[PDB]
């Protein structure tokens, strides 16, 4: 009522005074400081009149930057800080696959388009520059794949491996080292581990997307719930006759639990 | 055929959240520690006092715990991750003890770095690896899963190989380096006020829209 | 020269003075503190 | 549209302003 | 004072328990003897031997551990290494 | 055994009330040399066994309990003299001991966040929490009776009351106990500052409620030697007003 | 000369109070207490500092007599801790502190027993 | 110094003003200041070491320029880049490109030795995931993809370090040579066709950077803002 209106007016005056004091302090800084502004960073970017086409189930991190001709299929994941800008060419990422965080899937020329198949992992900080990776492959963390490289189905490039131009990684084979020597044969248990890793990371992507697609109200509500349910007392709960069950909001899905 | 979602966020008006709590797991950052605004700590991340998490890196402890110890430095654009179980049957949580300097493009997964360690950039530590106390790995070194770096040694090469033993004078400089990057992190820390002023910008945007 | 080490240092400075000084005092006080701590046996009957 | 809708918070603000005024009057009259 | 049974006492008790079977004979029983082959017994005989051992020693043997008691040496090691015996 | 707030309250609050009660029932009512002899024997035992038992302790709470027992023994020397200066010294010692105990238990509750149990747990605290290490070392030295801090004021004025008391035996036993019982405080200070343990127990920061109280108490303890006239005058007036 | 960790791995077994058989994996040079804590049958917060002064017999494990001959004998401090921190003030003659049990390939395959856990909170 | 003292005083005044603003917001019932927003700034400064970036030079919003970077005209810094020059300056010429997810940073502390400022010339590609650490690269050069360059590394004009190469301290890559391998070593001499390819790649990549900057300079989407705000 009138009390609320008066308190709102007082708060407005106090807010104006505080903003004036903040501006005075910023002026006294000497102009060196760079004021923090809005985000200005767009996750999905349309370039060359050519828009990204991502599925409704793909988890694309807000820190991830997809630009231009990236087309990502069902159940895929693009993690935090990964860059996929198909502007001079196209990038086609299949279904059930994951491109982990801080990685880069760039394409060149205008022709060596970047193709990544299904149920394939491209590990942390991995660099791709126009590769053709087939289904159910495995590129390790830090592996860099140059122009025209082709990796066959069920083939592994180990961590920190340079794979040069026009090199073909054959099926059921592991390639490791700076000039990417042949290493091993990637046995059946390893292939099963590859498939299980793809499925588990798809589930982890679903969990991450569910957590990351929350607005301010959901974030605040779950923060309050987490703070209140962080620690529990059983003596007083038993004395009162209460249980204090964990809410379903903080229950992590069993797909990502050991 | 893939079906694009019409209600997909192509612009969040706010970058990636620095702290991403998964379920009941809330990332914990010590007040003395400095984590850059560009980092992403997701899941079971625990950064202790004096840590120097530098811009551009990511720590995703959703699969298993990730721990950064006292005065530990993790540098720009590195990646830290973990997974259930390891090839060595030891606990697979990523542990980095005190006085450990970790370079720019370090790719750490299920490592057990003992205190007072130096690790160069482009260094990769796969699952089950541990670098023992008072050890140095130079830039570009990659350790295979289950490989260990013995204490008091320097290692190098794309396959990790022993180069030479470490003299006491060289060993004593690891904590000095750790506290030096700690001091630089403290210098970086003073530029951030407790609360950002971006909410004024979002309120201005709301007023402009209506 | 023999007096400098055989008598002054080993027999007196590191010997009788130290045995009857910080060393023996430390040992006796350690054992006495242990014996006193043995009294607190954690028994209500003992306290009564 | 320009009113605070929390009755409890409004009463708390009124009590705080009353407290400040009372403390100031006590200091001036003491 | 004392949490594990003595190795010699365990060996003697296990040997005596094995000796108390009609089918077995004291001549062919040795500290390292396989129940199925050396003693000429059957699956039910081995199961009953394990049950008699656990009844004598007064503690329940897990299923897999009992399945891995196919020898007198294995039985002695398990009983001597168990704190509930 | 009791929860840390409970034991802090038990160590701080009942002491002053029971001692004021003792002054009002014994010094006023039943004032006679036999009561002072009883409390002299009790003070000798309290100091000697408190020092001896706290030397052998390896837990923070038990060490605090035995330090409390020893300081009660010092309050008992102040009582067992039973003069004007004796009662004034008793009151000064009670005030200083209450302040020091509030300081120590505030620090303990600050370290309770990470569940500190043993003396070794606070090892290498001079690196993780420097200012906390200096604050707790200052508290330990105050418990010792090092001059610049507040504990020494109560200490020497108790000893002065004992020298004007005629109780040379009591004063000598008290001072020998003061020398003997310094060792475990020094061991605490060593654990914070001198040791380099293989593994460190990182302690979470404080709350403002404990931090403000700890800052005020540490400032009072460290800077009490610059201005003890108010406390000395108040305690003298209280001792004089006990009778007239 | 690859310097892996599987060589340092020492594999042993533990039967806890209720009799369940457990497999415990710990590195050589790392104590049995650390190995059991990593396995998860000992509360990590109960025992944090691997020191005799900070040990209150919360790391106590009963070991077989045929295994006691493969590790160094109990020290005076260890015996004192066992005597003091016990239900009855007696020495179990088969129990040793987990802090002083330095794992090694000689002790690889050792079978230990974890007694009933004790409270440690205040 | 007096400048740093005034900087600290300004920080105190700004903190007090922001606290007053938040008090007024709480009085109004507006709790949106509690909304945790990204505080990342594309250009971040130290006390008196603000980065310089010429106009008509592309800097991606995800790129972070910390400290004493000195970007020149017509050059590009792409998404995910980190450019740290707090300990010592970073000089970056005209027409160069710092491609995606790259890092150009100066050494922290003086424990190893004197801190060498980072220098990058004109019309030079600086790699696609490179980690340059206080080195000098001359004009019309091609630092390769995911390449490590340690302090003291001097790459001459028209010289190539291939992808994945790790050039160690105090190493000089001479004119018209390719260096690669983890212990960076010479492989094969360059050709005038490859040098022309380097220059043409630099030019067309600067053009692509201009296109990216033009596309990114568009106004923020009110539709996307409303979509995020409402549910
Ligand atoms: C004034 C007293 C009061 O509680 O005012 C309500 C307001 C708002 O209360 P509130 O309930 O909106 O928020 C609680 C959280 N704080 C108070 C931290 C913002 O409280 C204050 O302004 C208290 C801080 C300033 C005191 C001067
Ligand atoms: Fe122990
Ligand atoms: Zn590219």
From TrEMBL, chain A:
<dbReference type="InterPro" id="IPR001451">
    <property type="entry name" value="Hexapep"/>
</dbReference>
<comment type="similarity">
    <text>Belongs to the gamma-class carbonic anhydrase family.</text>
</comment>
<keyword id="KW-0479">Metal-binding</keyword>
<dbReference type="GO" id="GO:0045271">
    <property type="term" value="C:respiratory chain complex I"/>
</dbReference>
<feature type="binding site">
    <location>
        <position position="129"/>
    </location>
    <ligand>
        <name>Zn(2+)</name>
    </ligand>
</feature>
<dbReference type="InterPro" id="IPR050484">
    <property type="entry name" value="Transf_Hexapept/Carb_Anhydrase"/>
</dbReference>
<keyword id="KW-0862">Zinc</keyword>
<dbReference type="InterPro" id="IPR011004">
    <property type="entry name" value="Trimer_LpxA-like_sf"/>
</dbReference>
<dbReference type="InterPro" id="IPR047324">
    <property type="entry name" value="LbH_gamma_CA-like"/>
</dbReference>
<feature type="binding site">
    <location>
        <position position="106"/>
    </location>
    <ligand>
        <name>Zn(2+)</name>
    </ligand>
</feature>
<protein>
    <submittedName>
        <fullName>Gamma carbonic anhydrase 1, mitochondrial-like</fullName>
    </submittedName>
</protein>
<dbReference type="GO" id="GO:0031966">
    <property type="term" value="C:mitochondrial membrane"/>
</dbReference>
TrEMBL record, chain D:
<protein>
    <submittedName>
        <fullName>Uncharacterized protein</fullName>
    </submittedName>
</protein>
<feature type="transmembrane region" description="Helical">
    <location>
        <begin position="11"/>
        <end position="28"/>
    </location>
</feature>
TrEMBL record, chain E:
<keyword id="KW-0444">Lipid biosynthesis</keyword>
<keyword id="KW-0249">Electron transport</keyword>
<keyword id="KW-0443">Lipid metabolism</keyword>
<dbReference type="GO" id="GO:0000035">
    <property type="term" value="F:acyl binding"/>
</dbReference>
<keyword id="KW-0813">Transport</keyword>
<keyword id="KW-0275">Fatty acid biosynthesis</keyword>
<keyword id="KW-0597">Phosphoprotein</keyword>
<comment type="pathway">
    <text>Lipid metabolism; fatty acid biosynthesis.</text>
</comment>
<comment type="similarity">
    <text>Belongs to the acyl carrier protein (ACP) family.</text>
</comment>
<keyword id="KW-0679">Respiratory chain</keyword>
<comment type="function">
    <text>Carrier of the growing fatty acid chain in fatty acid biosynthesis. May be involved in the synthesis of short and medium chain fatty acids. Accessory and non-catalytic subunit of the mitochondrial membrane respiratory chain NADH dehydrogenase (Complex I), which functions in the transfer of electrons from NADH to the respiratory chain.</text>
</comment>
<protein>
    <recommendedName>
        <fullName>Acyl carrier protein</fullName>
    </recommendedName>
</protein>
UniProtKB/TrEMBL annotation, chain H:
<dbReference type="InterPro" id="IPR011004">
    <property type="entry name" value="Trimer_LpxA-like_sf"/>
</dbReference>
<feature type="binding site">
    <location>
        <position position="128"/>
    </location>
    <ligand>
        <name>Zn(2+)</name>
    </ligand>
</feature>
<keyword id="KW-0479">Metal-binding</keyword>
<keyword id="KW-0862">Zinc</keyword>
<protein>
    <submittedName>
        <fullName>Gamma carbonic anhydrase 1, mitochondrial</fullName>
    </submittedName>
</protein>
<dbReference type="InterPro" id="IPR001451">
    <property type="entry name" value="Hexapep"/>
</dbReference>
<dbReference type="InterPro" id="IPR047324">
    <property type="entry name" value="LbH_gamma_CA-like"/>
</dbReference>
<dbReference type="InterPro" id="IPR050484">
    <property type="entry name" value="Transf_Hexapept/Carb_Anhydrase"/>
</dbReference>
<dbReference type="Pfam" id="PF14602">
    <property type="entry name" value="Hexapep_2"/>
</dbReference>
<comment type="similarity">
    <text>Belongs to the gamma-class carbonic anhydrase family.</text>
</comment>
<dbReference type="GO" id="GO:0031966">
    <property type="term" value="C:mitochondrial membrane"/>
</dbReference>
